[PDB]
């Protein structure tokens, strides 16, 4: 029945949720390297009225 389909095809979400978790951890790693955000001589600028950070 429906239960057996979920009982057998529940492994098809492992790789997608791993991809989602990898994207989340990539964001987490990126947010720790924000010490020169809007501080490089090349890309330094004044913030727009409705923004807090240049990138995330």
């Amino acid at each position: 029945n429906v239960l057996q389909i979920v009982r057998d095809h529940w492994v098809h979400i492992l790789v997608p949720v791993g991809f989602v978790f990898g994207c989340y951890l990539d964001r987490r790693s990126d947010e720790k390297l924000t010490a020169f955000r809007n501080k490089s001589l090349l890309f330094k600028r004044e913030l727009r009225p409705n923004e807090e950070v240049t990138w995330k």
Partner: protein, 174 residues
């Protein structure tokens, strides 16, 4: 056409002689050109008119990115990693721009050779000299840096060249 800059990509004025027939025989080239214009040019022109009308309704724009100048490897202190990074990136961008300048000059040279045709050795002497000068400068700049080239290595090469020139001038004055 306004697509490209006529000054950056010069074209000599086009001088086309007028037809001066000497026979009563019809011109098959003229007849086939009329057929081509009737059968191909008009349909493609109508199709492009429709496509451009569709494009004009959804006009939107894209921009050319501007980079401000940053201090170079000469101004950077020793093992000042951030300044070295900025200077290296700027040097790489300038290297790409110079490569494209050389490409533009080479395109000029090829176009002039093809255009002048059988009189290219004389009429293309102006584009050959510009190519010679541009290639000489580009070679002196980035001739033998290697696979792992960098702004530091290019600066060392320039320093070596300057030392050689100074020694030559001193020897000449001696």
């Amino acid at each position: 056409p306004d697509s490209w800059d006529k000054d950056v990509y010069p074209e000599p004025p086009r001088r086309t002689p007028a037809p001066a027939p000497q026979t009563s025989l019809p011109n098959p080239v003229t007849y086939l050109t009329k057929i081509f214009d009737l059968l191909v040019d008009r349909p493609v022109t109508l199709a492009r008119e429709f496509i451009e009308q569709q494009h004009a309704k959804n006009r939107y724009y894209y921009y050319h990115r501007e980079f401000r100048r940053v201090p170079d490897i000469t101004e950077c202190e020793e093992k000042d990693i951030l300044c070295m990074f900025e200077a290296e990136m700027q040097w790489r961008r300038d290297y790409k721009v110079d490569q494209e300048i050389v490409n533009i000059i080479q395109e000029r040279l090829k176009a002039c050779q093809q255009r002048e045709g059988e009189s290219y050795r004389q009429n293309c002497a102006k584009e050959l000299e510009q190519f010679t000068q541009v290639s000489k400068a580009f070679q002196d700049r980035y001739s033998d840096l290697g696979a792992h080239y960098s702004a530091r290595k290019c600066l060392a090469k320039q320093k070596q060249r300057m030392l050689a020139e100074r020694k030559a001038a001193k020897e000449a004055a001696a």
